[PDB]
Write a protein that binds this ligand. Structure first.
Ligand SMILES: *[C@@H]1O[C@H](CO)[C@@H](O[C@@H]2O[C@H](CO)[C@@H](O)[C@H](O)[C@H]2NC(C)=O)[C@H](O)[C@H]1NC(C)=O
Ligand SMILES: *[C@@H]1O[C@H](CO)[C@@H](O[C@@H]2O[C@H](CO)[C@@H](O)[C@H](O)[C@H]2NC(C)=O)[C@H](O)[C@H]1NC(C)=O
Ligand SMILES: *[C@@H]1O[C@H](CO)[C@@H](O[C@@H]2O[C@H](CO)[C@@H](O)[C@H](O)[C@H]2NC(C)=O)[C@H](O)[C@H]1NC(C)=O
Ligand SMILES: *[C@@H]1O[C@H](CO)[C@@H](O[C@@H]2O[C@H](CO)[C@@H](O)[C@H](O)[C@H]2NC(C)=O)[C@H](O)[C@H]1NC(C)=O
Ligand SMILES: *[C@@H]1O[C@H](CO)[C@@H](O)[C@H](O)[C@H]1NC(C)=O
Ligand SMILES: *[C@@H]1O[C@H](CO)[C@@H](O)[C@H](O)[C@H]1NC(C)=O
Ligand SMILES: *[C@@H]1O[C@H](CO)[C@@H](O)[C@H](O)[C@H]1NC(C)=O
Ligand SMILES: *[C@@H]1O[C@H](CO)[C@@H](O)[C@H](O)[C@H]1NC(C)=O
Ligand SMILES: *[C@@H]1O[C@H](CO)[C@@H](O)[C@H](O)[C@H]1NC(C)=O
Ligand SMILES: *[C@@H]1O[C@H](CO)[C@@H](O)[C@H](O)[C@H]1NC(C)=O
Ligand SMILES: *[C@@H]1O[C@H](CO)[C@@H](O)[C@H](O)[C@H]1NC(C)=O
Ligand SMILES: *[C@@H]1O[C@H](CO)[C@@H](O)[C@H](O)[C@H]1NC(C)=O
Ligand SMILES: *[C@@H]1O[C@H](CO)[C@@H](O)[C@H](O)[C@H]1NC(C)=O
Ligand SMILES: *[C@@H]1O[C@H](CO)[C@@H](O)[C@H](O)[C@H]1NC(C)=O
Ligand SMILES: *[C@@H]1O[C@H](CO)[C@@H](O)[C@H](O)[C@H]1NC(C)=O
Lengths: 194, 656, 194
């Protein structure tokens, strides 16, 4: 069924007509955080949080894993990468590895690599931007795209359990998606009255 | 700052009690400048001057809430009506105190009436609570009074809607008549023995006499009545062991008036907390407009919650009735009213006294005296149900088969087809054949007797609309099934969707489909496109009001044939066989094995090659009943061995 | 669809959940005139007043023809027995016809039928209560029922157009409807927001 768009900050007057067009099972939602809270509260009021009614949201909806807000159905599928396994110390260690790898592999090409800006007050060719398209440290493929993305990052597929927590379900390879549950787990109590 | 409160009251002592309750209502309710004034009126023998005195007193008084507490000494009918109508004209609230008629529950008549007593209809709730104690599910409802008893019947069907288990039979009649014995026979013939009655005194005494004439005080009978049946002359002729209901402090007048005055007092002290407060003026001087905060003050009175009370916790429901009322459950221990139970609104507790039943010992009546006799209806099907008149005197000629096996014949009852066309005798007759021997095997399996009768008119039964109000009804064998005249249809009944919605089906004992009888030039079944647009050379039809009619009414592409064969439908199958034998037809639509039997009888009769609607003849059954499991298991036991093959060797496989 | 009731004056919290389940076209609404304005305002605020939808009400809200609030949807179908073709004079003529028919027909059975009460101060076999069934005056089948109603009563089927007035549309046979317009148009303009 065609893509449902919203006009403005909804009065629950005209966007409700667009939401009543939905008779399918799985709904994809792409909006900001408070907009997701309002739309999921509306779908709770519309009864669109059922056992057959699945919701798959990106990391832009979730934001962070240490804060899980209210009005999320217990069984909300999210795709993010904020993992405790890829911890923040490992994050900054990989960042230092990428920076030192770029500086070292550019040092073999050009000598005067430290060329910094003087100051913020009082008003470049050998740059590291055009160099680290294919960079690799500790065997981890941390190469950078033209639009500033990791080529093979660690995509983590999580769900909301029966105790208001985000359980890690799936990890993602370079091509395949390594899943944990072949049979889809129900998560029957998405809310209370179900 | 004053508040006037009117009161319609009987005595002179309770006038002093009302004034004392007004004085006690001004005791602890603060040092505010509001006061409460009392106004009391008495009886008049006629109600017109009662309403006249009430309006002449209370138009000049400007009261807010009126208490009406008439005790019926001459007549038990409608004495608090005129004050209620008079104050409901101006939408002034009336608190009824002694009346309990369910006609006051409907606010379409009484716009501004409430009462702190529960009516008799909520007694049905207790009667629903009588079902969960002893695990009863089938009841027999006998409603005498047509004034308020339909409300109690509606409340009972509303509360049994949650279980989705209807009553077995409800009965309504006119108060005043005495000869109601046929209603008692209809209550007798059913397997349940739970009898629920709501009536006045005199009709209850009448049905008590007529039930004492008909052995209805014995073992197994359970009598369950209300307050109006355990008093008066009906108490003099009441059957022993009866279970009745009684209001705890239902005629204690003083504490009831005091609790009502406390309700009115807290309603007034809540009303003064709000603004936009008006007064109902002197309505006799040109005042046709209602009091503007009428529904506001009524909404205050409806949602008025209380935890104080001498009688107990008083609370109004969504219809303005007393919630969670304590009831006494009384038993009649040999013409002695004995309290055996108490009723809080959610649960029943019996006391240390034992509930002596109307029959013998103290054991509970398992009120399902299930019948060993089953009413059997069937139609005259020529390969299945041979129906043949008796030889000498109500008896069958003992005919033998080809192996010397005697044909197991039964004495059924066969009426003729046209009752005004000929002198109709309704003589007994002989029934045998395929389905009759199947029924004899079923009665051989489980210990139950049977009474085979036949249908009044030769139709299976169709969903036919009646003329007045375009209402749907049923006829035929299904019409005699749903009317209680039948219990188990053992007949060539075609299983489809519209029948199984209303009745239940066993597993099918015969598997066959629809086919075409012709005279032999090929036709090749339903897929001949020249029969899709028939003419005067394609004269074919089916049996009037058969399953073929419904099956061709559902399928829309078969509509044109359905718009043709509706002009030539026949009353029975043998008439169509005799018509097509003389070449007055060209084809016929009927089931498989019947037409194969007719082809085995007559060589010119030819069945076609194609076959459609592969369905099954099973046994037509009732609703939820103990004849669902073992009947299907006995049919399946007849399928696993060669007994169905032996029945095929009797008539189905048998060529001539 | 489901049968939706209310409990109190609506919080627009949980009765809204009962109203959001409605997605079919035709809605039958049974409520008083003081409640119908608030209920139709809640329906308009939730987008239940489209021209795909339809609102049919009984005579409980259609009282005064002049008193029409702005919250009534243009396209409301109501039924009332108020006929502008039969005024009060024709109605009292029909009532006198019923009374004279009952008097002249009951006289043929027993003569001294009228026996009035003497006075209203200080308190019958043949009555017209069980004789009113078989009455026919001037061709009008004015027969009565056991509940006190009419067997063939005069009904009027009205609509609410865009001109904010009531138009007499449907008249009545012995049993069935006679529509002036077999064409049912949109009646689309509830307001300019469609
Ligand atoms: C308070 O109630 C008393 C008793 O009902 C009222 O006194 C009556 O006033 C009427 C006025 O016509 C007299 O005819 C009666 O004689 C009085 N009572 C008796 C003795 O029956 C009194 O007027 C009320 N006061 C107010 C206005 O609050
Ligand atoms: C039931 O009837 C009895 C008859 O005695 C009444 O109860 C007594 O009423 C008097 C007068 O109001 C009170 O002083 C007593 O407190 C009551 N009895 C007790 C508890 O001793 C009353 O009319 C009715 N209701 C009650 C309270 O049982
Ligand atoms: C009438 O009221 C009492 C409370 O005073 C009810 O007792 C409760 O009943 C439920 C269900 O049986 C129990 O789960 C609660 O524990 C009970 N509470 C108390 C405080 O007793 C009682 O059920 C009601 N009906 C009767 C008379 O049985
Ligand atoms: C249906 O047939 C079964 C055959 O097993 C009957 O079940 C037995 O009948 C007794 C009767 O008291 C029951 O207590 C038991 O459930 C069964 N036997 C035992 C001891 O297991 C069943 O009664 C039949 N139902 C009817 C009457 O149609
Ligand atoms: C990495 O990218 C550079 C261009 O920036 C390219 O010249 C080089 O061949 C690549 N590395 C490999 C796979 O040799
Ligand atoms: C993709 O996956 C593996 C890691 O699982 C990686 O080493 C390699 O680059 C890729 N190999 C394949 C199968 O293409
Ligand atoms: C009227 O009274 C008798 C009394 O036995 C009752 O059986 C019957 O139902 C009524 N009419 C008759 C005599 O059939
Ligand atoms: C009541 O029961 C007896 C049982 O012997 C029987 O004669 C008949 O069914 C009834 N007789 C009467 C009316 O006493
Ligand atoms: C209450 O009374 C005030 C003053 O007369 C009036 O303005 C107001 O309309 C009333 N309350 C309502 C309906 O808001
Ligand atoms: C019923 O009786 C019990 C026991 O006296 C009491 O606790 C309860 O409040 C009573 N309820 C009412 C409403 O009379
Ligand atoms: C039923 O049928 C026959 C023949 O139609 C008819 O004469 C009679 O009324 C009935 N039975 C008897 C007694 O023959
Ligand atoms: C027949 O009924 C009797 C009495 O209930 C019972 O003893 C017997 O088991 C039943 N079955 C037979 C053998 O027909
Ligand atoms: C209704 O009309 C049908 C004809 O369509 C007729 O057979 C029947 O007798 C009428 N009345 C009844 C009793 O249903
Ligand atoms: C009413 O009376 C008239 C007199 O001709 C006649 O139609 C018939 O006897 C009666 N009809 C009804 C409905 O009773
Ligand atoms: C009612 O039916 C009669 C025929 O029985 C017919 O003459 C008359 O016109 C009908 N009335 C209406 C309002 O059509």
């Amino acid at each position: 069924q065609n893509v449902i768009t919203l006009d403005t900050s909804f009065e629950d007057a005209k966007t409700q007509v667009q939401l009543k067009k939905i008779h399918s099972s799985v709904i994809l939602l792409y909006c900001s955080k408070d907009e997701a809270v309002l739309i999921l509260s509306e779908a709770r009021s519309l009864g669109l949080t059922g056992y057959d009614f699945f919701w798959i949201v990106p990391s832009l909806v979730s934001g962070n894993t240490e804060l899980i807000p209210k009005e999320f159905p217990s069984g909300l599928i999210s795709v993010s990468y904020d993992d405790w396994d890829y911890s923040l110390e490992a994050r900054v260690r990989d960042g230092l590895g990428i920076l030192t790898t770029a500086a070292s592999s550019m040092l073999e090409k050009f000598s005067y690599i430290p060329e910094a800006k003087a100051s913020c007050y009082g008003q470049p060719l050998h740059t590291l931007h055009q160099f680290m398209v294919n960079v690799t440290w500790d065997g981890k493929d941390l190469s950078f795209t033209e639009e500033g993305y990791q080529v093979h990052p660690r995509l983590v597929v999580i769900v909301l359990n029966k105790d208001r927590e985000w359980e890690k379900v799936g990890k993602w390879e370079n091509q395949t998606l390594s899943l944990r549950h072949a049979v889809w787990p129900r998560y029957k109590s998405f809310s209370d009255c179900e | 700052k004053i508040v006037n409160i009117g009161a319609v009251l009987s005595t002179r002592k309770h006038e002093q009690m009302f004034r004392e309750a007004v004085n006690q209502a001004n005791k602890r309710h603060g040092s505010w400048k509001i006061q409460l004034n009392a106004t009391s009126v008495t009886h008049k023998p006629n109600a017109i001057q009662m309403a006249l005195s009430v309006c002449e007193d209370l138009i000049s008084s400007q009261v807010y809430a009126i208490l009406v507490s008439h005790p019926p000494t001459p007549n038990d009918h409608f004495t608090p009506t005129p004050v209620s109508y008079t104050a409901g004209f101006y939408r002034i609230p009336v608190l009824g105190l002694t009346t309990r008629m369910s006609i006051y529950s409907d606010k379409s008549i009484h716009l501004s009436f409430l009462r702190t007593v529960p009516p008799y209809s909520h007694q049905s709730s207790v009667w629903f609570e009588m079902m969960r104690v002893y695990n009863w599910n089938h009841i027999i409802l006998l409603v005498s009074d047509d004034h308020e008893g339909r409300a109690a019947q509606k409340r009972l069907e509303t509360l049994l809607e949650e279980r989705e288990s209807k009553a077995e039979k409800v009965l309504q009649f006119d108060p005043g008549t005495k000869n109601v014995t046929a209603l008692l026979m209809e209550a007798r013939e059913l397997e349940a023995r739970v009898i629920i009655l709501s009536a006045s005194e005199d009709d209850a005494a009448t049905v008590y006499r007529a039930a004492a004439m008909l052995n209805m005080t014995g073992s197994g009978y359970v009598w369950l009545v209300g307050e109006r049946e355990i008093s008066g002359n009906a108490l003099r002729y009441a059957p022993d062991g009866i279970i009745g209901l009684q209001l705890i402090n239902g005629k204690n007048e003083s504490a009831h008036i005091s609790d009502a005055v406390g309700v009115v007092a807290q309603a007034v002290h809540e009303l003064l907390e709000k603004e936009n407060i008006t007064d109902p003026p002197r309505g006799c001087v040109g005042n046709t407009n209602i009091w503007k905060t009428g529904p506001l003050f009524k909404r205050v009175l409806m949602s008025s919650k209380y935890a104080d009370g001498v009688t107990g916790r008083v609370e109004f429901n969504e219809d303005g009735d007393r919630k969670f009322a304590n009831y006494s459950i009384m038993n009649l221990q040999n013409r002695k009213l004995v309290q055996v139970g108490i009723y809080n609104g959610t649960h029943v507790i019996p006391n240390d006294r034992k509930i002596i039943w109307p029959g013998g010992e103290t054991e509970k009546p398992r009120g399902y005296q299930m019948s060993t006799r089953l009413k059997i209806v069937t139609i005259h099907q020529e390969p299945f149900v041979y129906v043949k008149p008796t030889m000498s005197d109500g008896t069958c000629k003992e005919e033998f088969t080809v192996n010397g096996d005697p044909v197991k014949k039964v004495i059924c009852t066969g009426p003729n087809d046209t009752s005004p066309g000929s002198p109709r005798h309704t003589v007994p007759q002989c029934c045998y054949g395929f389905c009759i021997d199947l029924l004899i095997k079923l009665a051989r399996t489980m210990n139950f007797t049977y009474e085979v009768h036949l249908v009044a008119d030769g139709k299976f039964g169709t969903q036919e609309r009646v003329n007045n109000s375009n209402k749907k009804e049923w006829n035929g064998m299904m019409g005699e099934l749903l009317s209680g005249q039948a219990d188990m249809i053992v007949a060539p009944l075609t299983i489809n969707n519209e029948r199984a919605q209303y009745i239940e089906f066993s597993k099918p004992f015969k598997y066959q489909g629809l086919t075409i009888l012709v005279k032999k030039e090929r036709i090749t079944g339903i897929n001949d496109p020249r029969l899709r647009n028939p003419s005067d050379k394609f004269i074919y039809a089916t049996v009037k009001q058969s399953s073929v009619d419904i099956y061709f009414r559902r399928q829309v592409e078969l509509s044109t044939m359905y718009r043709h064969m509706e002009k030539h439908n026949y009353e029975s199958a043998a008439e169509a066989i005799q018509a097509v034998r003389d070449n007055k037809l060209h084809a016929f639509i009927w089931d498989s094995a019947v037409l194969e039997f007719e082809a085995s009888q007559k060589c010119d009769l030819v069945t076609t090659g194609e076959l459609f609607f592969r369905s099954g003849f099973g046994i037509g059954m009732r609703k939820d009943s103990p004849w669902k499991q073992n009947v299907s298991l006995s049919i399946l036991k007849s399928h696993e061995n060669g007994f169905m093959e032996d029945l095929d060797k009797t008539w189905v496989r048998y060529q001539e």
